[PDB]
Amino acid sequence: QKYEKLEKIYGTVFKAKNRETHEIVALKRVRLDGVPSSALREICLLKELKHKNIVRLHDVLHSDKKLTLVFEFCDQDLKKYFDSCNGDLDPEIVKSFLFQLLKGLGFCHSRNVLHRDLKPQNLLINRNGELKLADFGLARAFGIPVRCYSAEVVTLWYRPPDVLFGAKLYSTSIDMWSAGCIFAELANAARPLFPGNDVDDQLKRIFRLLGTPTEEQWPSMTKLPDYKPYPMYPATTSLVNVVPKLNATGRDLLQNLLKCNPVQRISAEEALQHPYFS
Amino acid sequence: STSELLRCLGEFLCRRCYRLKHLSPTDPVLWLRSVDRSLLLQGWQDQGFITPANVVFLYMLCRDVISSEVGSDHELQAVLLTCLYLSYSYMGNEISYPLKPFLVESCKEAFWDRCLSVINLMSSKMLQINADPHYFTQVFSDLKNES
C-alpha cells in the first residue's frame, strides 16, 4: 500500500513511487487464483541473485489475495529500445550491451542458475546505458543430479537446436545460444536472427544458415527424443552476410555462441575473455 | 531409494512434533505420496516428483520450518504441504504445478503466508543445497540417520 500506481506498463506490470521514500519502482502483481509456483520460484532465485546486471527485487507483498513483487524500475526493455532507435546501433552500444548481458549472465551461471528465457523483451535498459537481466519466471537452480528438467523452456526464436530436438536435459550452454541470437539481433537491424513459424521451421532457418549438424560434429544428437534428419544444407558460415555492423573478431564470437552442439558453446567467462572485448 | 528416505522423513516429523504421540512415520509419507499421485492427473507431470534428492530437498525445508509445538496433525499436513509445494515450485521438473492438492488448510490467506515466511527464511539454503554438493551430502546424511 505504501505505493502510488501510475502509468500501467504473470499479472500486469506497473510503474510507481514509494510515496514515502519517493523512489520509483515497478510492481508485478500476481493473481493467486501454475503461475503462482512460477512466481514463488522467481522470488526465491532473485533473493540470491544480486548484481548490477540483474534486475533487483526490493520486496514482496501479499495483499488482497495477490502477490506483488516490488521490482526496481527500468526505463525500457531492449525490444522497445530496438524500436526507439531503428535499424542500427553504434557498434559500441552493441559491445556494451553484450558485455553487460554476458556479465549478468555469467553471474547467474556462477551462482548455479539457468535463466532459460533469454530474449530481447527480458533485457532491461536504462537511459544511463546499463542493461539488466529480468523475468526469472522460467529460471531454476541446478546442481543436484536431476534425471532431467523440461523442454518447454525459452521462446521459440531463441530456443537452441538441441532443445528443439526435444532434449529435456541441458546445461548453462542453453542460455549461451539465446545470448548468441540476441547478439546477432544486437549487431544488425535489430531483427531476430531465426524467426521460425514453428519448431520444424525454427530448425530449418538455423541449419540453413549454420549448416546442418553431422553426427561427427554432434554425435549424441540422433539419440534425442525429437531428433529429425534434416537435409544437409550448405554452411553459409560467411555470417558476414547476416551481421555487417560486426568486425571479423566479433563474428568469431558470434560463431562460438551459435554452435548447434551444446557442448561446443563457449561459456560466459570465455565469451567475456574473448578478443572482441578490449 | 525414495521410500526409505520417506520413512526417515516421517520418522523425523514425529521426533519433531512430539506433541502428537498418535502419529506414525507412515502418515506423513501417505500425505506426500497422495498429491504426487493425483498430480498424475497427467498434463501436470509425466514423471513422479518424489525422488531421493527431492525428499532430501524437502527434509531440508521441514527441518528448519516445522515447529516443534505443532498442535494437531492437520496443522502439520498443512505446513508440510506448503514445504512440498515449494519443493515442487523450485525443484519441479515441470515449469509449474497446480495448488489443488497442496491447499488442505481453510484460510487460503495463511497458506500463502507460510509460502512467503519459508521463502524468506530458506531462500539461501534452497539454492545452496543445489550449488554446494558437500552441503547436499550433509543434509542427505542427516536425513539418512534420522531413522
Tab-separated table of C-alpha atoms in Angstrom, chain A:
chain	number	residue	atom	x	y	z
A	1	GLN	CA	0.000	0.000	0.000
A	2	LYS	CA	2.924	2.376	0.621
A	3	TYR	CA	2.899	2.788	-3.165
A	4	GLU	CA	1.341	5.069	-5.755
A	5	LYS	CA	0.356	3.337	-9.008
A	6	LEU	CA	0.958	5.334	-12.207
A	7	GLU	CA	1.032	4.609	-15.940
A	8	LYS	CA	0.454	0.862	-16.306
A	9	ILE	CA	3.185	-0.884	-18.292
A	10	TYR	CA	2.438	-13.136	-14.719
A	11	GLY	CA	-0.054	-10.429	-13.839
A	12	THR	CA	0.280	-6.866	-15.105
A	13	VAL	CA	3.243	-4.535	-14.527
A	14	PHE	CA	3.006	-1.047	-13.049
A	15	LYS	CA	5.356	1.890	-12.522
A	16	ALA	CA	5.152	3.647	-9.137
A	17	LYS	CA	6.553	5.929	-6.437
A	18	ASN	CA	7.248	4.664	-2.943
A	19	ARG	CA	5.249	7.748	-1.926
A	20	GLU	CA	7.015	7.504	1.429
A	21	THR	CA	10.634	7.449	0.223
A	22	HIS	CA	9.642	8.805	-3.222
A	23	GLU	CA	11.649	6.141	-5.103
A	24	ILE	CA	10.129	4.797	-8.329
A	25	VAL	CA	9.737	1.035	-8.662
A	26	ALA	CA	7.821	-1.450	-10.802
A	27	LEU	CA	5.079	-3.741	-9.446
A	28	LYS	CA	4.216	-7.149	-10.918
A	29	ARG	CA	1.043	-8.227	-9.037
A	30	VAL	CA	0.400	-11.953	-9.491
A	31	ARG	CA	-3.088	-13.435	-9.250
A	32	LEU	CA	-3.260	-16.137	-6.600
A	33	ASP	CA	-6.379	-17.687	-8.149
A	34	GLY	CA	0.830	-22.889	-12.092
A	35	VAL	CA	1.513	-19.135	-12.316
A	36	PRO	CA	1.962	-18.795	-8.530
A	37	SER	CA	4.546	-21.569	-8.248
A	38	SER	CA	6.473	-19.944	-11.080
A	39	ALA	CA	6.293	-16.619	-9.244
A	40	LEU	CA	7.491	-18.121	-5.964
A	41	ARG	CA	10.478	-19.573	-7.808
A	42	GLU	CA	11.426	-16.222	-9.314
A	43	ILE	CA	11.281	-14.671	-5.834
A	44	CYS	CA	13.460	-17.469	-4.359
A	45	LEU	CA	16.100	-17.140	-7.060
A	46	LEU	CA	16.142	-13.346	-7.240
A	47	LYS	CA	16.666	-13.085	-3.477
A	48	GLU	CA	20.033	-14.802	-4.104
A	49	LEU	CA	20.995	-13.025	-7.363
A	50	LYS	CA	22.205	-9.516	-6.570
A	51	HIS	CA	24.280	-7.943	-9.339
A	52	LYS	CA	24.137	-4.582	-11.163
A	53	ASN	CA	23.272	-6.546	-14.297
A	54	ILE	CA	20.383	-8.483	-12.780
A	55	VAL	CA	17.151	-6.648	-12.025
A	56	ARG	CA	16.677	-6.062	-8.321
A	57	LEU	CA	13.751	-7.303	-6.250
A	58	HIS	CA	13.150	-4.803	-3.427
A	59	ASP	CA	10.254	-6.522	-1.675
A	60	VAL	CA	7.290	-8.884	-1.971
A	61	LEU	CA	3.799	-8.153	-0.649
A	62	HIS	CA	0.836	-10.441	-0.044
A	63	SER	CA	-2.335	-8.338	-0.227
A	64	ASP	CA	-5.892	-8.739	-1.498
A	65	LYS	CA	-5.176	-12.338	-2.426
A	66	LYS	CA	-2.403	-11.220	-4.776
A	67	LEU	CA	1.389	-11.258	-4.598
A	68	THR	CA	3.038	-8.013	-5.613
A	69	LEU	CA	6.728	-8.232	-6.418
A	70	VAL	CA	8.171	-4.778	-5.891
A	71	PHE	CA	10.903	-4.588	-8.529
A	72	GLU	CA	13.377	-1.837	-9.324
A	73	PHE	CA	12.381	0.236	-12.340
A	74	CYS	CA	13.987	0.307	-15.783
A	75	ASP	CA	13.211	2.805	-18.489
A	76	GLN	CA	12.514	0.194	-21.155
A	77	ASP	CA	13.066	-3.352	-22.424
A	78	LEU	CA	15.605	-3.996	-25.186
A	79	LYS	CA	12.831	-4.871	-27.601
A	80	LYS	CA	11.330	-1.396	-27.269
A	81	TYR	CA	14.867	0.021	-27.387
A	82	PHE	CA	15.241	-1.546	-30.839
A	83	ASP	CA	12.141	0.446	-31.847
A	84	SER	CA	13.368	3.644	-30.138
A	85	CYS	CA	16.316	3.980	-32.480
A	86	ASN	CA	15.887	1.979	-35.667
A	87	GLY	CA	17.687	-0.482	-37.915
A	88	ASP	CA	21.009	0.420	-36.265
A	89	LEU	CA	23.084	0.786	-33.100
A	90	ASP	CA	26.549	2.285	-32.815
A	91	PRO	CA	28.863	-0.803	-32.889
A	92	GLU	CA	29.945	0.435	-29.455
A	93	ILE	CA	26.479	0.088	-27.917
A	94	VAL	CA	26.376	-3.416	-29.353
A	95	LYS	CA	29.521	-4.208	-27.404
A	96	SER	CA	28.322	-2.627	-24.169
A	97	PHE	CA	25.003	-4.456	-24.220
A	98	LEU	CA	26.589	-7.819	-24.961
A	99	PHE	CA	29.200	-7.192	-22.301
A	100	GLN	CA	26.678	-6.475	-19.547
A	101	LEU	CA	24.402	-9.286	-20.681
A	102	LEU	CA	27.351	-11.673	-20.747
A	103	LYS	CA	28.347	-10.383	-17.339
A	104	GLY	CA	24.934	-10.555	-15.739
A	105	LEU	CA	24.536	-13.973	-17.309
A	106	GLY	CA	27.981	-15.160	-16.306
A	107	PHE	CA	26.963	-14.317	-12.771
A	108	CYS	CA	23.801	-16.464	-12.785
A	109	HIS	CA	25.720	-19.434	-14.031
A	110	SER	CA	28.304	-18.958	-11.277
A	111	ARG	CA	25.515	-18.862	-8.680
A	112	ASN	CA	24.080	-22.045	-10.255
A	113	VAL	CA	21.075	-20.614	-12.090
A	114	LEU	CA	19.793	-21.173	-15.618
A	115	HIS	CA	17.678	-18.306	-16.869
A	116	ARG	CA	16.168	-20.309	-19.741
A	117	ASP	CA	14.194	-17.380	-21.152
A	118	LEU	CA	16.728	-15.099	-22.771
A	119	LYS	CA	15.131	-12.791	-25.331
A	120	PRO	CA	15.178	-9.018	-26.018
A	121	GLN	CA	11.953	-8.439	-24.126
A	122	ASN	CA	13.526	-9.851	-20.938
A	123	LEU	CA	16.521	-7.489	-21.077
A	124	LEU	CA	16.035	-4.146	-19.373
A	125	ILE	CA	17.894	-0.967	-20.329
A	126	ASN	CA	18.165	2.387	-18.552
A	127	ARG	CA	18.827	5.693	-20.353
A	128	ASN	CA	22.053	5.598	-18.331
A	129	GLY	CA	23.010	2.927	-20.861
A	130	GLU	CA	23.102	-0.027	-18.455
A	131	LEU	CA	21.408	-3.387	-19.154
A	132	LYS	CA	19.879	-5.805	-16.664
A	133	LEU	CA	18.516	-9.345	-16.925
A	134	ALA	CA	14.873	-9.678	-15.911
A	135	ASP	CA	11.917	-12.043	-15.678
A	136	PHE	CA	13.315	-15.163	-13.978
A	137	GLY	CA	9.901	-16.820	-14.183
A	138	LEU	CA	11.434	-19.641	-16.193
A	139	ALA	CA	14.696	-19.757	-14.272
A	140	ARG	CA	15.725	-22.544	-11.918
A	141	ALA	CA	18.620	-23.682	-9.776
A	142	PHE	CA	20.780	-26.628	-10.806
A	143	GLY	CA	23.413	-28.780	-9.193
A	144	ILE	CA	21.568	-31.754	-7.794
A	145	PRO	CA	21.891	-34.759	-10.126
A	146	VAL	CA	18.463	-34.430	-11.735
A	147	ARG	CA	17.057	-37.022	-14.084
A	148	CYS	CA	16.035	-34.210	-16.480
A	149	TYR	CA	14.487	-30.716	-16.500
A	150	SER	CA	11.846	-29.649	-19.027
A	151	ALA	CA	11.906	-28.980	-22.746
A	152	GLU	CA	9.243	-26.251	-22.578
A	153	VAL	CA	11.786	-23.514	-21.986
A	154	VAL	CA	12.906	-20.424	-23.902
A	155	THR	CA	10.713	-18.718	-26.508
A	156	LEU	CA	10.806	-20.304	-29.971
A	157	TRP	CA	13.173	-17.877	-31.704
A	158	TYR	CA	15.838	-18.184	-29.030
A	159	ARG	CA	15.472	-21.896	-28.376
A	160	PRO	CA	18.700	-23.823	-29.093
A	161	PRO	CA	18.556	-26.682	-31.626
A	162	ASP	CA	19.172	-29.433	-29.037
A	163	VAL	CA	16.077	-28.390	-27.098
A	164	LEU	CA	14.173	-28.092	-30.381
A	165	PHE	CA	15.224	-31.693	-30.860
A	166	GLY	CA	13.276	-32.376	-27.674
A	167	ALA	CA	16.257	-32.519	-25.281
A	168	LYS	CA	14.947	-32.475	-21.687
A	169	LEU	CA	18.385	-32.283	-20.100
A	170	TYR	CA	20.695	-29.295	-20.697
A	171	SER	CA	23.362	-27.113	-19.113
A	172	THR	CA	24.212	-23.399	-18.951
A	173	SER	CA	25.027	-23.688	-22.657
A	174	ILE	CA	21.274	-23.238	-23.183
A	175	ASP	CA	21.346	-19.551	-22.195
A	176	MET	CA	24.516	-19.078	-24.247
A	177	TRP	CA	22.720	-19.876	-27.504
A	178	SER	CA	19.996	-17.408	-26.738
A	179	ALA	CA	22.777	-14.924	-25.930
A	180	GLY	CA	24.319	-15.515	-29.369
A	181	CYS	CA	20.951	-14.868	-31.035
A	182	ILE	CA	20.472	-11.680	-29.033
A	183	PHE	CA	23.979	-10.664	-30.156
A	184	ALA	CA	23.080	-11.238	-33.821
A	185	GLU	CA	19.970	-9.139	-33.255
A	186	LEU	CA	22.098	-6.538	-31.486
A	187	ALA	CA	24.567	-6.222	-34.345
A	188	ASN	CA	22.044	-5.792	-37.166
A	189	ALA	CA	18.682	-4.245	-37.994
A	190	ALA	CA	17.756	-5.479	-34.513
A	191	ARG	CA	15.522	-8.102	-36.161
A	192	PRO	CA	15.512	-11.671	-34.800
A	193	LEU	CA	18.116	-13.881	-36.496
A	194	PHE	CA	15.917	-17.023	-36.632
A	195	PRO	CA	12.154	-16.183	-36.622
A	196	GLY	CA	10.521	-19.538	-37.485
A	197	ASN	CA	6.752	-20.202	-37.522
A	198	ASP	CA	7.056	-23.457	-35.562
A	199	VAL	CA	9.683	-25.910	-34.323
A	200	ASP	CA	10.296	-27.540	-37.719
A	201	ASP	CA	10.654	-24.114	-39.271
A	202	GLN	CA	12.939	-22.930	-36.478
A	203	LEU	CA	15.280	-25.808	-37.158
A	204	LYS	CA	15.368	-25.111	-40.910
A	205	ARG	CA	16.366	-21.458	-40.621
A	206	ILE	CA	19.119	-22.412	-38.195
A	207	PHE	CA	20.644	-25.182	-40.255
A	208	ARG	CA	20.028	-23.279	-43.457
A	209	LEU	CA	22.482	-20.676	-42.138
A	210	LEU	CA	24.812	-22.580	-39.797
A	211	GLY	CA	24.816	-25.784	-41.808
A	212	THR	CA	23.040	-28.946	-40.677
A	213	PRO	CA	24.831	-30.858	-37.877
A	214	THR	CA	26.713	-34.052	-38.793
A	215	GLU	CA	26.879	-36.994	-36.401
A	216	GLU	CA	30.641	-36.356	-36.359
A	217	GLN	CA	30.332	-32.817	-35.031
A	218	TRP	CA	27.363	-33.693	-32.826
A	219	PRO	CA	27.336	-37.493	-32.091
A	220	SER	CA	24.677	-37.525	-29.362
A	221	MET	CA	22.084	-35.555	-31.419
A	222	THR	CA	20.431	-38.579	-33.091
A	223	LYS	CA	19.642	-40.038	-29.660
A	224	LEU	CA	17.439	-37.055	-28.834
A	225	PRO	CA	13.660	-37.598	-28.257
A	226	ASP	CA	12.547	-35.401	-31.148
A	227	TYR	CA	15.537	-35.589	-33.491
A	228	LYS	CA	14.903	-35.475	-37.256
A	229	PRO	CA	17.394	-35.906	-40.158
A	230	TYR	CA	17.137	-32.613	-41.995
A	231	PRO	CA	18.625	-32.066	-45.474
A	232	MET	CA	22.350	-31.293	-45.226
A	233	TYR	CA	22.079	-27.616	-46.215
A	234	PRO	CA	25.390	-25.874	-47.021
A	235	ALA	CA	27.151	-23.915	-44.294
A	236	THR	CA	26.555	-20.250	-45.186
A	237	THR	CA	29.047	-19.708	-42.350
A	238	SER	CA	30.092	-16.479	-44.070
A	239	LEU	CA	27.986	-14.887	-41.326
A	240	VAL	CA	29.205	-11.504	-42.562
A	241	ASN	CA	26.153	-11.720	-44.826
A	242	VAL	CA	23.894	-11.837	-41.784
A	243	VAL	CA	25.715	-9.418	-39.482
A	244	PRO	CA	27.659	-6.478	-41.162
A	245	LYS	CA	27.964	-3.987	-38.264
A	246	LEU	CA	30.345	-6.511	-36.739
A	247	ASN	CA	34.107	-6.889	-37.230
A	248	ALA	CA	35.750	-10.233	-38.065
A	249	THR	CA	36.715	-10.772	-34.431
A	250	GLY	CA	33.171	-10.109	-33.296
A	251	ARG	CA	31.837	-12.542	-35.871
A	252	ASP	CA	34.206	-15.142	-34.433
A	253	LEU	CA	32.495	-14.814	-31.029
A	254	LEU	CA	29.011	-14.941	-32.566
A	255	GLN	CA	30.124	-18.185	-34.184
A	256	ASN	CA	31.268	-19.752	-30.895
A	257	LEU	CA	27.959	-18.845	-29.293
A	258	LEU	CA	25.870	-20.307	-32.100
A	259	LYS	CA	27.286	-23.814	-32.054
A	260	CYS	CA	24.470	-26.315	-32.523
A	261	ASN	CA	26.144	-28.885	-30.303
A	262	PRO	CA	25.523	-27.605	-26.775
A	263	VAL	CA	28.947	-28.855	-25.596
A	264	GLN	CA	30.725	-26.721	-28.260
A	265	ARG	CA	29.182	-23.486	-26.928
A	266	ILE	CA	31.570	-21.062	-25.267
A	267	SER	CA	30.677	-20.122	-21.701
A	268	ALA	CA	30.058	-16.637	-20.369
A	269	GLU	CA	33.507	-16.493	-18.774
A	270	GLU	CA	35.201	-17.369	-22.062
A	271	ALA	CA	32.902	-15.112	-24.034
A	272	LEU	CA	33.904	-12.209	-21.780
A	273	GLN	CA	37.599	-13.065	-22.152
A	274	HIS	CA	37.154	-13.045	-25.918
A	275	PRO	CA	39.311	-10.777	-28.114
A	276	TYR	CA	36.188	-8.968	-29.354
A	277	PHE	CA	36.274	-7.342	-25.872
A	278	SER	CA	39.007	-4.738	-25.338
